[PDB]
């Protein structure tokens, strides 16, 4: 129930991209990882996710080291990942999407798998598109189906890459409401984005990476008033 | 065994390799049709018969092209999954690279069954049918078997007319350990009685003794105890690669029995055996590319790398073939040596990913 | 698709050019020109044995050089050695020279320094020499139109224009 | 102009790289075909032929891949959006074509003839008619030959069957221990240590020839690739003029192929840098195969040495014009007429 | 001048993406082309640019039809394009980027080319970056260099594809200021973007494209109070 990251560092072409980043996400908590664009936030996020091999530091869930571990094993430890890009199974139905992931849980009987299918369909209100192929779905329904597919692996943490990018304002409230539904489910949500305003409006803790290292942490009110943050990231006047 | 993610990757890979394989046989087909245009209008060989020949010879092209088709099919299909971020989220939800690889192998299995079934029943029968039709149409009733030669140990046989199980006008020459001609047999008609035994009607047999006596005898019948069955005869003129599997096995047995070098036919036998192994190696090499160097590259570079790798595999096959027999190595190894080499390459490229 | 139609047309022209080039080098290799009037078969240190229609050794010609021709069927020997056999088991005569000619009609002709020995050591006829002699191995009848010399065990004679056969030892001349 | 040089720089880099691959490949296969049939010198003298065939393809694929890359990472799109049109691409391509054409001209007129001439001298100085394993037939077709082993001419075990009478010779079957084959307007075969059996299986009168050596008949303009080009220019002969026209058609084909492939390299970012590889190689193959075929047709006297390879090059030139006007305003108004109608 | 687009339509694989979209930008006016994500604005913007072949409708700059014109021709007509991705020549110096574009204008002289290069550098504050290759430039410096490059072509209109994409709020005001510098230089700037807040702040007129068609137009307050926009795009409780 605690996903910890301690002193991460990664270099590229003999230049250090992330120097020192640390963060922690708890069950029941929504945590954003923000900061200047290209400053280090994204690489750190991917180092927790497993898409980037860390050069230094430790990634931890309940005092368990998942640094040297590939991505499928980090998932077996309780880490979910939703990519920014569309990752739904295009030529598969919504039903088969979720069932495809329930089938990778060998401890589940067939009856259990179908019970969870029914529950996940009804939970995220996608019963009516259960027969639809993935490629036939609008953006909001696609993301709802991709959320339920992720939860079919039973994760403890959900890592969302850029869940607000290119999203209409009438849809931001609905994404936040889904974020908050994950949090009230027990998950630990870690969100990385460039939309500061929406992310600070949903998250209860925020971390800020700039010039390659952590420069601020705490609640959104706390980070909005940090001097270095306003000097390199938000500016003198930043409307929330 | 029936996993949704298994048959999902499978369906995408066979869809892609079917397209690839249609395109390959289409291009080879139109090239064959111009080759047949080189000699149209011979006897009754109008353009319809040439189109008939090209259509009939398709399953042999399919067998010849199935390995590289499965290379490209896997590469494009897995590249598709890869580029729509489906493999990444499959891993981010539990399905490991090992599981992806097992999906690829599970869907390599039916492709291997199809290619051996082609090699056994479909492509050889269709190829002999195309060749025979072309010859009959091309000479207006001139080609079954007219003018057949054969060897059985020190014996040299020449038949004038061959039927389903009857020979007409048999001639036979025997030579001794001193490489000189001892006996000569001729018969108007020979029939096949039982296993490994023929019967010649009204046969004249000539024997040589002491270089001063030559005695011929007009026997009413003569029994011939040769290991040369009529099946074997009817297949001494086709290319070994075109002969079926069980036919190749019977033919290498006959060659080994008659004290003849059975290497080339053994090599063709093992090449027909190792064709499905080659297509599995080809699909794993594709997976090694999709995970390895061609992970975030465009479909064009995947297809061009696949063409380069398939071409290099074909050349390596045509190289390891003869060198295994001229250096004295079992045809089995000469046949599966390229599969091994590309398998080692695939495992090397997957050694850090898997 | 217009681009795909052009691509197919291009593939037609390519296939046609390739196979035209293959056919051209084939005709350059399929130039089977008929040969000239020369010895079709040649051999050296030859022993050619000839048999009768019943399978008995008729005669033997051992030569150092042999040339078989196709148009006429004349077989030229260099330094031939002809052994005649009575019923194949008895070598009755042995006739040699430096040059010989067999014909399609089985008629031999021997030119430079002809020798003829009779392997019967009690018949009184031992040796015969002449310049040129023709013999028909089938009938064994022989002709000679030039100087002839006979050497018997106790009687030697010298004449010309002989005509006999080794069949029955019938000799005849004037 | 700045940008023109830029294109040339990028392209010539890629071009040399591709050449370093192509030459290497041929340096492989040639050096293997030579060792199968000293070797260093012959391969070094065969280098100009590799150059003759590879320089066109080298620049062709070079500019195709380079421009493909620039189209992929959208440099060409941005150059269009600022006011850099086909003129500059075509100017850079023509300059590279002129460079490579001058190299190909020297390789085709002096280096290849002088190298083949030196190889001719060395060949004058220094140094397979029937196969084994099955029943062969001679070019005559009147004899059936069957050899056991041909291992550097050592242990043959030959069997020769002739079941048909030639003019006055009877059918025969001969078997020996070893025999050679040679080609001299005719092709002959010799047999060593054997016996020949002249007769028929039904009859009994044979003729047996025991031979230590026995011969038998099997079957029966000038070099144009190696010559001084200046003396060839006025040497009146069909195949001679064909060779001269091939040499000139290579140097003339370099710029034609360039102008054809410049419009062909356009690809969108979804497509690859390699998406035009099939069509481009297909075009190159068709051109060279038709060129070679017409060359052999002149050599046969089949078509006159006065029209020669001109029509093949003309068709290439016309094609390049077609594809280059395929982006003008008239063709775009035509396509739009079809779209709206 | 006045660029105009009338009754635009476009389809992709028998799917109608844009059905009826009209807009215009006049010299000296900032215009925001906004609307739901992928509901027609972006394809409309690319039809005007020239990157997408129009299927129906007419595109005219000063009553001259440039619809069928390829990129190069409608750039000579007076239309510039600044894409979202890095468009700078990595292997060329800032000096050489700008000179390379000025080298196309045959009516200028060598001295006039040098003069306009010096002015463009000291104008966009890139005189120090003069001799630096493009592959070594940061975010804002690259954008200034390529916008000075675009201006070397002497356009009448500037079509900006998402100029506020992933921008640190510190730099937001900086690109606002450069956008309005463009506008005061005598240009008509067409913005397409997803950041409704920042675009509506900069543009003087806004066109809203939803479900393939133009649904509302006018000033930023006009669309903010438009009820259809409020119910498909912005949300009732939207905050500029
Ligand atoms: C000389 C050339 C030899 C090579 C042959 C030429 C190529 C042959 C045809 C292959 C190209 C067609 O490529 C086609 O791409 C589409 C769209 O991405 C793939 O479609 C794919 O879509 C998505 C990802 O993109 C997958 O989730 C889906 O399962 C898959 O079908 C098809 O599976 C393939 O048929
Ligand atoms: C050396 C090998 C020579 C033959 C090379 C084959 O080259 C190959 O050509 C095909 C067919 O154009 C290209 O394939 C291209 O067209 C096909 C069919 O429209 C598309 O689906 C594909 O995505 C695109 O890249 C490959 O990207 C290229 O790699
Ligand atoms: C013996 C003769 C040997 C010489 C052979 C010469 C062969 C010449 C082949 C020409 C190939 C043309 O085939 C191909 O057609 C397509 C479609 O029309 C053209 O494509 C063209 O139109 C399409 C849309 O219609 C545009 O998107 C594209 O930008 C444009 O180039 C290609 O640019 C051209 O490459
Ligand atoms: O992905 C888009 C990126 O494209 C470029 O990067 C290129 C790089 O310049 C090229 O070197 C590498 O490989 C390009 C394609 C592979 C080259 C050889 C591949 C093999 C495969 C088949 C056999 C022969 C060729 O691709 C990346 C793109 O992924 C740009 O630098 C970067 O701005 C842009 O964001
Ligand atoms: O992305 C920018 C970089 O692109 C680089 O291209 C790399 C091109 C190399 C690809 C090789 C492809 C094979 C070639 C032989 C035929 C088969 C395909 C520029 O060389 C560098 O200048 C630049 O840094
Ligand atoms: Ca239940
Ligand atoms: Ca925003
Ligand atoms: Cl980052
Ligand atoms: Cl919900
Ligand atoms: Cl923000
Ligand atoms: Cl859109």
PDB file of C-alpha atoms in Angstrom, chain A residues 51 71-72 75-76 79-81 83 85-92 96 99-101 103-104 149 153, chain B residues 2-5 7-8 11-12 83-99:
ATOM      1  CA  UNK A  51       9.608   1.484 -19.604  1.00  0.00           C
ATOM      2  CA  UNK A  71       7.263  -4.564 -16.788  1.00  0.00           C
ATOM      3  CA  UNK A  72       5.108  -7.699 -16.673  1.00  0.00           C
ATOM      4  CA  UNK A  75       2.342  -5.551 -12.930  1.00  0.00           C
ATOM      5  CA  UNK A  76       2.224  -8.853 -11.047  1.00  0.00           C
ATOM      6  CA  UNK A  79       1.347  -1.731 -10.672  1.00  0.00           C
ATOM      7  CA  UNK A  80      -1.109  -0.710 -13.378  1.00  0.00           C
ATOM      8  CA  UNK A  81      -0.189   1.510 -16.332  1.00  0.00           C
ATOM      9  CA  UNK A  83      -0.533   4.883 -21.689  1.00  0.00           C
ATOM     10  CA  UNK A  85      -1.905   6.755 -26.572  1.00  0.00           C
ATOM     11  CA  UNK A  86      -4.827   4.483 -27.377  1.00  0.00           C
ATOM     12  CA  UNK A  87      -3.893   1.031 -26.100  1.00  0.00           C
ATOM     13  CA  UNK A  88      -7.219  -0.808 -26.445  1.00  0.00           C
ATOM     14  CA  UNK A  89      -7.320  -4.152 -28.279  1.00  0.00           C
ATOM     15  CA  UNK A  90      -8.700  -2.859 -31.568  1.00  0.00           C
ATOM     16  CA  UNK A  91     -10.073  -6.006 -33.198  1.00  0.00           C
ATOM     17  CA  UNK A  92     -11.473  -7.376 -29.925  1.00  0.00           C
ATOM     18  CA  UNK A  96     -12.923  -9.932 -24.711  1.00  0.00           C
ATOM     19  CA  UNK A  99     -11.649 -11.288 -20.259  1.00  0.00           C
ATOM     20  CA  UNK A 100      -8.259 -11.379 -22.025  1.00  0.00           C
ATOM     21  CA  UNK A 101      -6.662  -9.891 -18.908  1.00  0.00           C
ATOM     22  CA  UNK A 103      -7.406 -14.959 -18.217  1.00  0.00           C
ATOM     23  CA  UNK A 104      -3.808 -14.196 -17.200  1.00  0.00           C
ATOM     24  CA  UNK A 149      -9.081  -3.728 -18.535  1.00  0.00           C
ATOM     25  CA  UNK A 153      -5.281  -7.353 -13.414  1.00  0.00           C
TER      26      UNK A 153
ATOM     27  CA  UNK B   2      -7.286 -21.375 -25.786  1.00  0.00           C
ATOM     28  CA  UNK B   3      -6.359 -17.930 -24.528  1.00  0.00           C
ATOM     29  CA  UNK B   4      -8.016 -14.843 -25.980  1.00  0.00           C
ATOM     30  CA  UNK B   5      -4.644 -13.108 -26.226  1.00  0.00           C
ATOM     31  CA  UNK B   7      -5.740 -16.402 -30.701  1.00  0.00           C
ATOM     32  CA  UNK B   8      -5.806 -12.600 -30.952  1.00  0.00           C
ATOM     33  CA  UNK B  11      -5.531 -14.220 -36.019  1.00  0.00           C
ATOM     34  CA  UNK B  12      -3.548 -11.023 -36.701  1.00  0.00           C
ATOM     35  CA  UNK B  83       2.681   0.310 -33.113  1.00  0.00           C
ATOM     36  CA  UNK B  84      -0.886   0.547 -31.835  1.00  0.00           C
ATOM     37  CA  UNK B  85       0.614   0.097 -28.293  1.00  0.00           C
ATOM     38  CA  UNK B  86      -1.122  -3.262 -27.806  1.00  0.00           C
ATOM     39  CA  UNK B  87       1.987  -5.304 -26.934  1.00  0.00           C
ATOM     40  CA  UNK B  88       3.072  -2.645 -24.448  1.00  0.00           C
ATOM     41  CA  UNK B  89      -0.224  -2.686 -22.591  1.00  0.00           C
ATOM     42  CA  UNK B  90      -0.282  -6.503 -22.799  1.00  0.00           C
ATOM     43  CA  UNK B  91       2.957  -6.470 -20.800  1.00  0.00           C
ATOM     44  CA  UNK B  92       1.738  -3.652 -18.547  1.00  0.00           C
ATOM     45  CA  UNK B  93      -1.159  -5.947 -17.544  1.00  0.00           C
ATOM     46  CA  UNK B  94       0.718  -9.157 -16.913  1.00  0.00           C
ATOM     47  CA  UNK B  95       1.301 -10.949 -20.232  1.00  0.00           C
ATOM     48  CA  UNK B  96       5.072 -11.388 -20.404  1.00  0.00           C
ATOM     49  CA  UNK B  97       7.379 -11.400 -23.390  1.00  0.00           C
ATOM     50  CA  UNK B  98       7.631 -15.166 -22.751  1.00  0.00           C
ATOM     51  CA  UNK B  99       3.857 -15.408 -23.111  1.00  0.00           C
TER      52      UNK B  99
END
